Amino acid sequence: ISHGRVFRRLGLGPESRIHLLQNLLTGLVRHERIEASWARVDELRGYAEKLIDYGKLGDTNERAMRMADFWLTEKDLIPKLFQVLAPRFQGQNGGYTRMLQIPNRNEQDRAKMAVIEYKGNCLPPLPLPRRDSNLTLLNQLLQGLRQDQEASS
Amino acid sequence: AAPKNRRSIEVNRCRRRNPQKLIKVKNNIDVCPECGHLKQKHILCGYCYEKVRKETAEIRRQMGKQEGGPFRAPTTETVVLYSGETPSEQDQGKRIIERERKRPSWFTQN
Amino acid sequence: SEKEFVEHARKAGLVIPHERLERPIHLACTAGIFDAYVPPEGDARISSLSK
RNA sequence: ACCAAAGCUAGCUCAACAUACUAAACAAAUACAAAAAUACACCAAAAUAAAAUAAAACAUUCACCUAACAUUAAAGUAUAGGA
RNA sequence: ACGAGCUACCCAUGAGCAGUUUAAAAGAACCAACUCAUCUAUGUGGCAAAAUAGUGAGAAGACUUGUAGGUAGAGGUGAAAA
RNA sequence: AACAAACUCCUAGCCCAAUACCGGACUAAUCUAUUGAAACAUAGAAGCAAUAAUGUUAAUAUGAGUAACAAGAAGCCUUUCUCCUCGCACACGCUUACAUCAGUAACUAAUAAUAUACUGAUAAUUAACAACCAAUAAACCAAAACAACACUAAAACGUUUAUUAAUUACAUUGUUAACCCAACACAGGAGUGCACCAAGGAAAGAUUAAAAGAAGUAAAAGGAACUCGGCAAACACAAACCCCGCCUGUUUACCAAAAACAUCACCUCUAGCAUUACUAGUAUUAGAGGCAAUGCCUGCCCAGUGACACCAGUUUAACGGCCGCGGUAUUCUGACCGUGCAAAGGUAGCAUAAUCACUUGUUCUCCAAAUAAGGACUUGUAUGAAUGGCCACACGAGGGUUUUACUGUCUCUUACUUCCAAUCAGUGAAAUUAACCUUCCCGUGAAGAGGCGGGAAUAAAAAAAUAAGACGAGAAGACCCUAUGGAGCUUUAAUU
RNA sequence: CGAUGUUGGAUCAGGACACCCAAAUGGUGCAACCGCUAUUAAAGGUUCGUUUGUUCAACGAUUAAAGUCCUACGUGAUCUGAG
Ligand SMILES: Nc1nc2c(ncn2[C@@H]2O[C@H](COP(=O)(O)O)[C@@H](O)[C@H]2O)c(=O)[nH]1
Ligand SMILES: [Mg+2]
Ligand SMILES: [Mg+2]
Ligand SMILES: [Mg+2]
Ligand SMILES: [Mg+2]
Ligand SMILES: [Mg+2]
Ligand SMILES: [Mg+2]
Ligand SMILES: [Mg+2]
Ligand SMILES: [Mg+2]
Ligand SMILES: [Mg+2]
Ligand SMILES: [Mg+2]
Ligand SMILES: [Mg+2]
Ligand SMILES: [Mg+2]
Ligand SMILES: [Mg+2]
Ligand SMILES: [Mg+2]
Ligand SMILES: [Mg+2]
Ligand SMILES: [Mg+2]
Ligand SMILES: [Mg+2]
Ligand SMILES: [Mg+2]
Ligand SMILES: [Mg+2]
Ligand SMILES: [Mg+2]
Ligand SMILES: [Mg+2]
Ligand SMILES: [Mg+2]
Ligand SMILES: [Mg+2]
Ligand SMILES: [Mg+2]
Ligand SMILES: [Mg+2]
Ligand SMILES: [Mg+2]
Ligand SMILES: [Mg+2]
Ligand SMILES: [Mg+2]
Ligand SMILES: [Mg+2]
Ligand SMILES: [Mg+2]
Ligand SMILES: [Mg+2]
Ligand SMILES: [Mg+2]
Ligand SMILES: [Mg+2]
Ligand SMILES: [Mg+2]
Ligand SMILES: [Mg+2]
Ligand SMILES: [Mg+2]
Ligand SMILES: [Mg+2]
Ligand SMILES: [Mg+2]
């Protein structure tokens, strides 16, 4: 009975789970876009989002510093978190991460795959799904309705 | 526990041709507006994502060449440029990667 | 428990046994046409004229 | 429709004959731990065949059972046997 | 006829035994390497035609162990368990 | 009445069931003799006909796409991270499995990616290390142990002197490896020297987070109430008492490690001796045995059976034995009396025992409660003295009992992790299996029915779970009996 | 007998009624409380410990009561193995 369990079991145990996410996160902060097992990426996303929040607490905060010290494994990144990533998220509260499902891995294990990304990175943009345009027949029919909600008010 | 009798072919056909063991037809397949290959509706297009992946690889390669070693990563934002381009005033003060290829149609300048 | 398949068919051109042919290939014909006669460009309008 | 199926050859068997009976191949190496050119020694030998089995058990006995004399008969006779 | 390259017991010839405790290298003591195989759970076409995990017993001796040699079935060998 | 058969009529016939044994008539397919010539006839011959041997070989199913198997993460692709620690060399063994380039549709890897293991081509380990590498005389009693000097069990390892030893660059041979023995690229077995990391490696193919199973950590109050037993576990890692063996040691490789064996000690027997054992020894020695250190002891018997003495006679630390009936002290007992039989008549000790039964003997202690444990009583009429009897120290993975302590053993279970698990992808076994279109009840029946009778029930198919039945699978029952079937062992079996 | 694996526990219990408890009654050498009998009723219940391998049995403490039996002396392809 799994009721209300938020964290999925990975690795060799709870600790191995933390270290798996450690590596994933470090990879994410370095390269800013990575791809991995859909489940693991999903699991990661929360952490990846909170790390930016500790980053916003600034260099001088001790808690944030040893936090970043534990999570970012290659130490050289710790400045990047504080002096690059954390600044470029200022206005936005929670919007840091984009996560999409990629087609299943071509290897024989055929896994379920996801790409995860920090917004505002400098890379060729992911081919996101576009909503239909407004010129589409159905949407036009709705535009009619809208303008008649404006005309009747 | 060992089977008491050989299961006949009729019984067996009943088991393995049963509806629940058949592959189920996927109805969510569609065409990518871009390249006109196939994709499932809730998933990124494989072909397009390959374009992006290759280019990303090349960029990362060339930004590994600008870093003399494993542990040097910039303390500044970076921006990637293509043949016949120059850094904007807004984009200066940043790390600059210069690629030979002309800027791809899907990739915007931003 | 140890037995393998046979018969993977291959065509290998090699010049050495091709040279060792004891009865060299006898041709009834030559593959090309030596001199190609190149006709008049108005040969359609001279065809309705007999002489 | 897959998996499959069908061949007639390779050689063999049994006798006959036959000269006579250890084939072929030997450059080197071969009985050192065979195939390793070269140092004072040793070297060599023989003793009954037995039992399974039959006798409805088993105890004397039990044809043939790696010893040239064939064939037609005498004859399954004389004989021998826990007779 | 063939077998002692496993194993039983021998013969030659090598090799190991740290730390601690003791006047002591005393078939004493604690405890590794090493050697055994107590109890339990796994395992039971198994990792394994006898193992794994824990736990145990000995650990300068009637100790462990390498190499070469010996004893042969009416036999050998045996701190007898046929 | 009717309905109801291998009975009997009716219409036709080729005109009356059957197991072991017996008789008969035909006949498939081969071959041969003559025919024949779109596959036959008359004869003659035979390796002359397969639904049954846990038949043989090959091939295929079923079980089953089940059990089971594997590659730490990202990335700029061999760079960083996250973890775990059997490493380098030599000997023995293996024999090119090593190296470079290329290939991998399929073949090896229990799966891929790719390649130390599949395929092909081409190369390679170079002696200084190692192997190979004198005889005959003669002086030497004097351990290795940091060797000063000693201990007992008396100890591996060489100098010098003399006599001759071809005398003259370069001889020959081992040099790869991720390796060997286990049918496997096997969690097993493997000698030595150095190291504990500077070297080696990866527990997870991807998910999900059901049961049951495995492995772990934690647990309210209680603390052995669990149970054959505190087995296992534990924040405990302590004390006592019995039985048996003195002790360290040994044993049934693969169900027994013990109370069995050995053993110091003590005892019997047998030997007066020389070049292969015993022994290069000589009765304070050497063999054959018994018993089990120490301590107190080891009583009586030579009639039988042995063995000495070839007969007498001697031997029990040789095989082995060690009794009754009647009458008596006012009474139960029986010092005493009678008498029979024996070779001697069971002595000392110990005792309801690891000791036929009676037996849960009786009583005391221990517990709220004991067929347990301990202490006594004790004819044990079947104890008992080297096939040893009694005490005892120390010792014991031996077998029993108490106390403390500790605890999920239990009251009475619970939470969470990992492996299994279930889903996705790859590969893909096993016993088993007359055929199955494979229900329940009561009856029946080779005496316990899915299958018969009488009733009930009943669209068809997966996937997950449980084990009541299929007298479920395994192994031609090890128990039991039989066979004029075996073998091992012992003798007072018979032949020798 | 080309195997129908055997005692007692554990777990889960299915059934009978010849009722131990709970319910309704008849008779009493039934005043009352207790009891002793007999009829009817099987939905539900039927304890925890010390010793024994034990089933029985003895004993301690209780209970509304601590039933008698059948089920391959129920149940080992679920466990135990003391006997
Ligand atoms: N000795 C004997 N056995 C018979 C006789 N009849 C029938 N049998 C036996 O009975 C059995 C078969 O009986 P059925 O099948 O003939 O009714 C077989 O064992 C068969 O030998 C007879 O007359 N004598
Ligand atoms: Mg006979
Ligand atoms: Mg016969
Ligand atoms: Mg016989
Ligand atoms: Mg004979
Ligand atoms: Mg005579
Ligand atoms: Mg040997
Ligand atoms: Mg030492
Ligand atoms: Mg010692
Ligand atoms: Mg072990
Ligand atoms: Mg444990
Ligand atoms: Mg240990
Ligand atoms: Mg010890
Ligand atoms: Mg000890
Ligand atoms: Mg030998
Ligand atoms: Mg014999
Ligand atoms: Mg013998
Ligand atoms: Mg021994
Ligand atoms: Mg014995
Ligand atoms: Mg015996
Ligand atoms: Mg009729
Ligand atoms: Mg008739
Ligand atoms: Mg008839
Ligand atoms: Mg014929
Ligand atoms: Mg035949
Ligand atoms: Mg057939
Ligand atoms: Mg079979
Ligand atoms: Mg058959
Ligand atoms: Mg299949
Ligand atoms: Mg199945
Ligand atoms: Mg599985
Ligand atoms: Mg792995
Ligand atoms: Mg090999
Ligand atoms: Mg190679
Ligand atoms: Mg493969
Ligand atoms: Mg080497
Ligand atoms: Mg996992
Ligand atoms: Mg897995
Ligand atoms: Mg579970």
Ligand SMILES: [Mg+2]
């Ligand atoms: Mg558990």
Ligand SMILES: [Mg+2]
């Ligand atoms: Mg615990």
Ligand SMILES: [Mg+2]
């Ligand atoms: Mg507790």
Ligand SMILES: [Mg+2]
């Ligand atoms: Mg108890």
Ligand SMILES: [Mg+2]
């Ligand atoms: Mg109890």
Ligand SMILES: [Mg+2]
């Ligand atoms: Mg224990």
Ligand SMILES: [Mg+2]
């Ligand atoms: Mg304890």
Ligand SMILES: [Mg+2]
């Ligand atoms: Mg204790």
Ligand SMILES: [Mg+2]
């Ligand atoms: Mg002992």
Ligand SMILES: [Mg+2]
């Ligand atoms: Mg054993």
Ligand SMILES: [Mg+2]
């Ligand atoms: Mg042993």
Ligand SMILES: [Mg+2]
């Ligand atoms: Mg022991």
Ligand SMILES: [Mg+2]
């Ligand atoms: Mg054992």
Ligand SMILES: [Mg+2]
């Ligand atoms: Mg003894």
Ligand SMILES: [Mg+2]
């Ligand atoms: Mg004495």
Ligand SMILES: [Mg+2]
């Ligand atoms: Mg004594």
